[PDB]
Amino acid sequence: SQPPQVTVDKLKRLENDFGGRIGVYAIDTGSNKTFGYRANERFPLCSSFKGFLAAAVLSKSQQQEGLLNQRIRYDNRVMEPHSPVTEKQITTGMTVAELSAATLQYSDNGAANLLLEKLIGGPEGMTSFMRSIGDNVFRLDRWELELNSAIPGDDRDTSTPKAVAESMQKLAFGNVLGLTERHQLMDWFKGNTTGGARIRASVPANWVVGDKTGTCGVYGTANDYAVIWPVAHAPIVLAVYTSKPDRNSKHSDAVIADASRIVLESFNIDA
Ligand code: NA
Ligand code: NA
Ligand code: NA
Ligand code: NA
Ligand code: NA
Ligand code: NA
Ligand code: NA
Ligand code: NA
Ligand code: NA
Ligand code: NA
Ligand code: NA
């Protein structure tokens, strides 16, 4: 049993080298072993909320039959940066399921804002959904892209590593979504395209990982949260969030990967 103090000191050295703050929370879903470091401190969500937005859409669909196959047109809409899928499909519109997949797997901003506008009731509505699953920490205050400002000590558009991990655990393995909807959500996480250098980089290529990244573009602020399915072990839920004090500092994918490696080494997994 690696003493938790050992794990904490490895993370302190890592965040000192990085020049900022690293916050982590992990849960072993078989043993209920947990580990946290800065787990109750707030960090900006950046795009990480989009995974929960997809979940909010699936939840909504459980009380509105047919919702996922409905199409949303936006032919004369002003489109946001980092909207690769919705920019491409503007001539056709997209179904609610397609928007949800895009916002999670490609971090698509147009898709996020469209779903917040037309289905989820804005940042307020997103926040209310999280409250409805027992998350009293998450808060979405602003839309894309202004939510990326990541100002030191601004609690808007933040959560904590613990609350992110706990909410991921609730959605992946709990009671919020029915079986079909829960499978859909986790398949979307599994097919995420933006996380190859973050938590996925800390585990063997043959383990299965579902994740969603966040990158604010300022204040060295970036993150990842995931479910990890090791070979012959219960799944692990992990959240890793970072920040740096200078606005022009870049984040580091390597640092997120290394934080993930340190934390996972602390679970008794065959790798
Ligand atoms: Na110490
Ligand atoms: Na529901
Ligand atoms: Na459904
Ligand atoms: Na799709
Ligand atoms: Na709020
Ligand atoms: Na405001
Ligand atoms: Na849970
Ligand atoms: Na085993
Ligand atoms: Na499982
Ligand atoms: Na910080
Ligand atoms: Na400073």
Automatic annotation (TrEMBL):
<dbReference type="InterPro" id="IPR000871">
    <property type="entry name" value="Beta-lactam_class-A"/>
</dbReference>
<dbReference type="InterPro" id="IPR045155">
    <property type="entry name" value="Beta-lactam_cat"/>
</dbReference>
<keyword id="KW-0732">Signal</keyword>
<protein>
    <recommendedName>
        <fullName>beta-lactamase</fullName>
        <ecNumber>3.5.2.6</ecNumber>
    </recommendedName>
</protein>
<dbReference type="InterPro" id="IPR058220">
    <property type="entry name" value="KPC-2/SME-1-like"/>
</dbReference>
<keyword id="KW-0046">Antibiotic resistance</keyword>
<feature type="disulfide bond">
    <location>
        <begin position="46"/>
        <end position="216"/>
    </location>
</feature>
<dbReference type="GO" id="GO:0030655">
    <property type="term" value="P:beta-lactam antibiotic catabolic process"/>
</dbReference>
<dbReference type="GO" id="GO:0046677">
    <property type="term" value="P:response to antibiotic"/>
</dbReference>
<feature type="domain" description="Beta-lactamase class A catalytic">
    <location>
        <begin position="23"/>
        <end position="242"/>
    </location>
</feature>
<dbReference type="GO" id="GO:0008800">
    <property type="term" value="F:beta-lactamase activity"/>
</dbReference>
<dbReference type="InterPro" id="IPR012338">
    <property type="entry name" value="Beta-lactam/transpept-like"/>
</dbReference>
<dbReference type="Pfam" id="PF13354">
    <property type="entry name" value="Beta-lactamase2"/>
</dbReference>
<comment type="similarity">
    <text>Belongs to the class-A beta-lactamase family.</text>
</comment>
